[PDB]
Amino acid sequence: DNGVLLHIHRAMHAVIDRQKNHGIHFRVLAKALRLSGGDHIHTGTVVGKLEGERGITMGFVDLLRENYVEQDKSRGIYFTQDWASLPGVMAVASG
Amino acid sequence: QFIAYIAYPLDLFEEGSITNVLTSIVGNVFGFKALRALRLEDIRFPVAYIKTFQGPPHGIQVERDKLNKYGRPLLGCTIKPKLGLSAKNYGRAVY
Amino acid sequence: GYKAGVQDYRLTYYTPDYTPKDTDILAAFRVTPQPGVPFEEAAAAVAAESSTGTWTTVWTDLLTDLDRYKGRCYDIEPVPGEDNQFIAYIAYPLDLFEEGSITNVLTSIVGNVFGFKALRALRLEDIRFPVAYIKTFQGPPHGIQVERDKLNKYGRPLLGCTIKPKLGLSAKNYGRAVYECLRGGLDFTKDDENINSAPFQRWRDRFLFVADAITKAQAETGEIKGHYLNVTAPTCEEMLKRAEYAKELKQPIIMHDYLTAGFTANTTLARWCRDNGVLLHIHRAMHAVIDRQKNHGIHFRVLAKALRLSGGDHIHTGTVVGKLEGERGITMGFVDLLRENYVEQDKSRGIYFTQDWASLPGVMAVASGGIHVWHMPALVEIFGDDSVLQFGGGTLGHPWGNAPGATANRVALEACVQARNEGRNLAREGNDVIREAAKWSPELAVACELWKEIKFEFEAMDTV
Amino acid sequence: GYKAGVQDYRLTYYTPDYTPKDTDILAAFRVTPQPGVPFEEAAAAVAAESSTGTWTTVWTDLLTDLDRYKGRCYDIEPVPGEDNQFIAYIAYPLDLFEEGSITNVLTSIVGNVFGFKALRALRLEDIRFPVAYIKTFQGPPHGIQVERDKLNKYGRPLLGCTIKPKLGLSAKNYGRAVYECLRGGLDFTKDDENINSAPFQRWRDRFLFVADAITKAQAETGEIKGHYLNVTAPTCEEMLKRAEYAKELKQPIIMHDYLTAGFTANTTLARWCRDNGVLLHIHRAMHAVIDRQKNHGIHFRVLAKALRLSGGDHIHTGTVVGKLEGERGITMGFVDLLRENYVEQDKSRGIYFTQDWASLPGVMAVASGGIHVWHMPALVEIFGDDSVLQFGGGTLGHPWGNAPGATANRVALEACVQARNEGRNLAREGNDVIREAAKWSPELAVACELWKEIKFEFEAMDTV
Amino acid sequence: GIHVWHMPALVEIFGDDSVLQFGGGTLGHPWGNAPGATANRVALEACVQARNEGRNLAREGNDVIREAAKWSPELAVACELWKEIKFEFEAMDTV
Amino acid sequence: ECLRGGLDFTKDDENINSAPFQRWRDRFLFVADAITKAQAETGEIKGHYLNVTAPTCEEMLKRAEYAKELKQPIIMHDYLTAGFTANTTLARWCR
Amino acid sequence: MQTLPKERRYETLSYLPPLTDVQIEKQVQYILSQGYIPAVEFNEVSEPTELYWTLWKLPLFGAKTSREVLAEVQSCRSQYPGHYIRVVGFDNIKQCQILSFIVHKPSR
Amino acid sequence: MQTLPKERRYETLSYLPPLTDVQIEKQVQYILSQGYIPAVEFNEVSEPTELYWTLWKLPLFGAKTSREVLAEVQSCRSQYPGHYIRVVGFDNIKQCQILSFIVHKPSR
Numbered sequence A: 001d002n003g004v005l006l007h008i009h010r011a012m013h014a015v016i017d018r019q020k021n022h023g024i025h026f027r028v029l030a031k032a033l034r035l036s037g038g039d040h041i042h043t044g045t046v047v048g049k050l051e052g053e054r055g056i057t058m059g060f061v062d063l064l065r066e067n068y069v070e071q072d073k074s075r076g077i078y079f080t081q082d083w084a085s086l087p088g089v090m091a092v093a094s095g
Numbered sequence B: 001q002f003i004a005y006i007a008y009p010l011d012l013f014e015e016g017s018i019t020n021v022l023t024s025i026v027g028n029v030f031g032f033k034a035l036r037a038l039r040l041e042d043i044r045f046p047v048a049y050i051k052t053f054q055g056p057p058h059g060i061q062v063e064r065d066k067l068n069k070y071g072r073p074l075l076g077c078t079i080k081p082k083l084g085l086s087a088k089n090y091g092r093a094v095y
Numbered sequence C, D: 001g002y003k004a005g006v007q008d009y010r011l012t013y014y015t016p017d018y019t020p021k022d023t024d025i026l027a028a029f030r031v032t033p034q035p036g037v038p039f040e041e042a043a044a045a046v047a048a049e050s051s052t053g054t055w056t057t058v059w060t061d062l063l064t065d066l067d068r069y070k071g072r073c074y075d076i077e078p079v080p081g082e083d084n085q086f087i088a089y090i091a092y093p094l095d096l097f098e099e100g101s102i103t104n105v106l107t108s109i110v111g112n113v114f115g116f117k118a119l120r121a122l123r124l125e126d127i128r129f130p131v132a133y134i135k136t137f138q139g140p141p142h143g144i145q146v147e148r149d150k151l152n153k154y155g156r157p158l159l160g161c162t163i164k165p166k167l168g169l170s171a172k173n174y175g176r177a178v179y180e181c182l183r184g185g186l187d188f189t190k191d192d193e194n195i196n197s198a199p200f201q202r203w204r205d206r207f208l209f210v211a212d213a214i215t216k217a218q219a220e221t222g223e224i225k226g227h228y229l230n231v232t233a234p235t236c237e238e239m240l241k242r243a244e245y246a247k248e249l250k251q252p253i254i255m256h257d258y259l260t261a262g263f264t265a266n267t268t269l270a271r272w273c274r275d276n277g278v279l280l281h282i283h284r285a286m287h288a289v290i291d292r293q294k295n296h297g298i299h300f301r302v303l304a305k306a307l308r309l310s311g312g313d314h315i316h317t318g319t320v321v322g323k324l325e326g327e328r329g330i331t332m333g334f335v336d337l338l339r340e341n342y343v344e345q346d347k348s349r350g351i352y353f354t355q356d357w358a359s360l361p362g363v364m365a366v367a368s369g370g371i372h373v374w375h376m377p378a379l380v381e382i383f384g385d386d387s388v389l390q391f392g393g394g395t396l397g398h399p400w401g402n403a404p405g406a407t408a409n410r411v412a413l414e415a416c417v418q419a420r421n422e423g424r425n426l427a428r429e430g431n432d433v434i435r436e437a438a439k440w441s442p443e444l445a446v447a448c449e450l451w452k453e454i455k456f457e458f459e460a461m462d463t464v
Numbered sequence E: 001g002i003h004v005w006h007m008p009a010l011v012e013i014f015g016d017d018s019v020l021q022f023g024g025g026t027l028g029h030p031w032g033n034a035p036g037a038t039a040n041r042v043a044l045e046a047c048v049q050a051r052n053e054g055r056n057l058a059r060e061g062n063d064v065i066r067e068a069a070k071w072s073p074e075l076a077v078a079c080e081l082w083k084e085i086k087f088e089f090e091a092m093d094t095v
Numbered sequence F: 001e002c003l004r005g006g007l008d009f010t011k012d013d014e015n016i017n018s019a020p021f022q023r024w025r026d027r028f029l030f031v032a033d034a035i036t037k038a039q040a041e042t043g044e045i046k047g048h049y050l051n052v053t054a055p056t057c058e059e060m061l062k063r064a065e066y067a068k069e070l071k072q073p074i075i076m077h078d079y080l081t082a083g084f085t086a087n088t089t090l091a092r093w094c095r
Numbered sequence G, H: 001m002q003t004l005p006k007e008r009r010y011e012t013l014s015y016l017p018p019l020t021d022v023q024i025e026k027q028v029q030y031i032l033s034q035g036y037i038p039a040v041e042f043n044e045v046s047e048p049t050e051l052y053w054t055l056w057k058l059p060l061f062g063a064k065t066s067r068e069v070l071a072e073v074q075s076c077r078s079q080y081p082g083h084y085i086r087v088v089g090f091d092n093i094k095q096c097q098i099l100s101f102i103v104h105k106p107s108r
């Protein structure tokens, strides 16, 4: 309504999305942010994380920016997500 | 260890509400006596439910037009230390 | 590359190979082109000029993605027994329309495609709304099911009356006539579409005296009584001001004319009615200017779909037998389209597209226009149980008055409902039930004798 | 005495002896009755049903003074060379209509007389407003004379442009196209009738970038520039909210679609425009659905008259030569009716009644719809000085871009205005003035070569 | 997931300043909502009576229920339906 | 032209309010442009009495508000024809 | 001409002459043939303002014949002589009552 | 293709090549033949924001020939070389300006 850009900090995410057996993965929390509203989102740094965990990061990063995301099991995405001309969110790489 | 795929009808959820879709699905299935651990991996939103939401206030394309910045990634900086500085000293570090 | 000049409309707008998506708005046009104009060009020009079309090629088209946003004609079907007459099917992408706005969808499709030099007549027969687009709209404020729960009335169609004459009566004499109709046995009473705020009776006086008339009639009979108060006004401020005073007097229902006031004003009121718990009656004044002729205009089934999305609890569907035009096959078409959740495609009925409403509430049908006691078993069988039957002249024109006139209509309806529930055909035994009920009620016996000879029978202009 | 039954409509509604009063609303109907129905009965039914009419006699009629409030037919004039076709003249008392309400005068007269079983077709040709009724209305917010003082522009018609394509462009790209047009030499730019607030470009983004485009163009040329921002919205609240932001950015002019949004919304905005000092442009989207056919509907001259009372500074009248329908004799009829203070009765022109406005300001005529550089001298002579000429595809479709395209139109207009003032006929030397001006300007010479062959010539459906 | 047999235990643990809720316990009665609510009220009032009198609710818990079921037919049916229904699993969060 | 020559004030006639031939809001805007030009040309403070006399108390205060918005030093009123109740209201506003 | 007498009415079927036991049996048969669930309700006072009546036992989900419904009406009538008694019909698909009519009025 | 050069414009008749003394005489002749009042206005700077210009003498109510108007333009031109000068035409019936065009620009 006022034409102000909104930056979103993902503080307290690690309490929920850390353990591989329990909680809610960050990709679900990232999807919820695109629907609720936000112009920038923190995605986390890519430095190490071997080769496997790097693919997961690029999974939800493409899921925030692209209009149409194809199903890919190796990347981490379980469903084909289609946004109806809904704007993308710019990724923040920091740390 | 197994993945369970569950379908929910569209009509039971409130329009333009992340609060409802979160309270309904991940309400109290966690903390059940019959299962030791539970984790939500992914979620799919249909087009019909996405159209109810506003989404991001501007998005990637509109933001770059307002800032007049094309071609490159944007550069940011976080002021250190987190807690201690004066309001006058904070502004000098920003400048 | 950029090329300046004049491009033919047929080249990049008519695509027969295209298959419509599920998230797409579809329209059926009945097109009549000028002599010497091909079928494809006439169909393409309607598809082009309605969405992203221009008479000459422009350079700014190359900056945007033209193929994504353009509306295209995918099927041409010729009309049997007709020269230069065909049905054109046009698909429009979901993204080009505004969310929750009838104004935009109406201004986009039927904006200026009519009045083209290249065609003599154009008609929009049917429109399809996708599930994804329907979800943005609020729809009706209450619907059929919630309305019956608030009124506490089950089993039968509802009964109403319109006060006559339309203009001339004082505020006090209006309320007296309102009281006498409700005392007899009618559920509702109604203001005429042209009653707003005239020099002889001002709105605030009418609102006060009608409220006193309901209160007395409710306490006397022991049933819930109501009256549709005409809220239609010159401005949006005056309209909302009149509705607030009806809310202040604890009134269950108000009425509005949607076409003469416009969709913008009607959507404003439908949101208000949701936030206050007030039922909304919709009068379809000025409809027959648009939907009369079979060669030109917009068919009423499009306007009926547009009202359900905009908002409204009741809608006038028109009587099959009466003083105004109506066709049985056509009527039952859009009547079953306003009430039901899922409607199958039927060409003989007049429905061109399969329509699906995503749990959106139904709108109640209102039958009115020159009906008396003899038309009762015909209306009950056709319109069903979830309908309102209104008698303007039929109630007040009784020789004994309004109170015996209302009791005559009430007995006649409840006799038809009882006979239906037992297992008797109202098409075969319609005259029998009315005649046998007139033996134990003197009010019905007088009413039957007066309007025996009267029948409205004329040829309809709109046909399948 | 009270007599219950069915009364003939001819008995107490058709009076040939009656003479119309000075404070009386008069209507002219073109009636086509069903075979077997008299001329007098058809005219009486239209006169009755519109005001104080009912199918059966009611007892409540005796309490009121029926003779004072009833509408009556005073004259029947048969159409030459036509069987079962006549012109009906009906008088309406002033006291039955609401003050300052177009909605009431529309819902009363053309409410439900159309779609009557007894007549196959009906057309409202012309309506007469008395001085006493006109005085209740606000009229246009500014009018012709005030507008020219605020814009500081005298001597010539105004120039405008429409951005193409209609849908697809980004908010940033939209503003770029706006800037390039105004830089060349056009007075105004315009949003398309279908542009409101789509997913690809939001309204608040469009409003911001256009404001920057005008600011640059005005400072560069040294002349006052504008852009009609589309304020048409789903609700009355959203409509006023968009208008407020245009006022905040210090914009001189906004636009609205009156027919699709309705008269209730249009009256609200015109009153707001008066209070805030903003000029109001009116688009006539969805007009041709009503006014196309010669047998059915409402003629545009009535819709033009109703807009002047409701409010508006500019109105689309339609080009005589162009892509959409127009008739020179008919057009010059209603164009002189919107601009002049006093209009004499002329049957050949199409004006059935002598219309007198009580010092009410004139509305500027807009000529738009598929016009190029060759149509310029024909438009200037027909529409005169107090008009706006708009070129959508004619500006942007130039081989060199927007800015040379905008210069091409500006040179062509100013060369014709100069030649007219000297004492040269534009009907005889129209080709010569354009050709001789294309010798010292390269931009005009390119545009002349491109659209030389293009001419829109088709038969008109609506005729006198 | 609580019914009429868990009543003497709940009074002992939570005391007086507490609210006890029965979702399926009230609506799961063979007779309806009204006789289901009366069965729950009678059981609680009897447990309060025995506590104030000076009787141990952990040892004489079943005795108070059976005595109350004698003069209340609504409670006698509820005790017949639910009696074997007990949730016994290992807890994850512990001291 | 009057303020240019060397007069301090100009005045609206007592009968000028808001007639069909010239509306009040138009007169207020054009006169404000004339004062601005004459003041800058001579170097002296110039003014004009704008007639705020109106049919209603709301219409009176509405006209006064717009004069303040255009930064006008002086307004005028007819105290005997409008009445003492209307005049006292405006005098308190002017303070 | 005749003046209409003032009478207190009871919604549906109240304007027709008082229903016989044969007529009630036919109306209940209509409910079962369509597939709706029949239920009995009772109240102390009949008022237009109040919209809830006290339910008698439970809705009859497993009713085979119209005789079983009439047996439940008779039991409620013998228990409460000074109460109003009505029969209702629930629809499960549309989630709205289809029929509602009064069978008993307080005896004197 | 060609790009349009940036140029400052002065309302009506500013896009045509500069007006000759014969052409101005023809434009003034138009004003008088219709029955409008001619007038001469001058200003220091030309801006879109300002809408009032200084009136030279008074509007010529008693003008018989177009030579009288041109003589008043020559008088204003010789007196003020560094000022803009325009010719305006007033209508008394409609109460609006019919024609307005600039005849002189500040010399160098």
Ligand SMILES: O=C(O)[C@@](O)(COP(=O)(O)O)[C@H](O)[C@H](O)COP(=O)(O)O
Pocket (backbone or CB within 6 Å): C162, C164, C192, C193, C283, C284, C285, C316, C317, C318, C319, C323, C324, C367, C368, C369, C370, C371, C390, C391, C392, C393, C394, D054, D055, D112
């Ligand atoms: O003004 C009238 O003519 C009516 O009151 C009928 O009066 P009577 O009941 O006294 O005949 C109704 O408004 C029309 O039926 C509207 O048409 P529709 O229902 O087709 O919208």
Ligand SMILES: O=C(O)[C@@](O)(COP(=O)(O)O)[C@H](O)[C@H](O)COP(=O)(O)O
Pocket (backbone or CB within 6 Å): C054, C055, C112, D162, D164, D192, D193, D283, D284, D285, D316, D317, D318, D319, D323, D324, D367, D368, D369, D370, D371, D390, D391, D392, D393, D394
């Ligand atoms: O959408 C269009 O068709 C136009 O932009 C014309 O486009 P071009 O200028 O590109 O031809 C105008 O809205 C019509 O002239 C309106 O018709 P009318 O004036 O008859 O209401």
Ligand SMILES: O=C(O)[C@@](O)(COP(=O)(O)O)[C@H](O)[C@H](O)COP(=O)(O)O
Pocket (backbone or CB within 6 Å): B028, E001, E002, E021, E022, E023, E024, E025
């Ligand atoms: O949804 C449910 O299960 C309940 O309504 C209980 O219903 P029943 O009584 O029918 O089981 C409660 O919300 C949860 O017990 C709350 O959990 P907590 O106490 O952990 O907040």
Ligand SMILES: [Mg+2]
Pocket (backbone or CB within 6 Å): C162, C166, C191, C192, C193
């Ligand atoms: Mg009516």
Ligand SMILES: [Mg+2]
Pocket (backbone or CB within 6 Å): D162, D166, D191, D192, D193, D194
């Ligand atoms: Mg357009």
Ligand SMILES: [Mg+2]
Pocket (backbone or CB within 6 Å): F012, F013, F014, F015
């Ligand atoms: Mg004076």
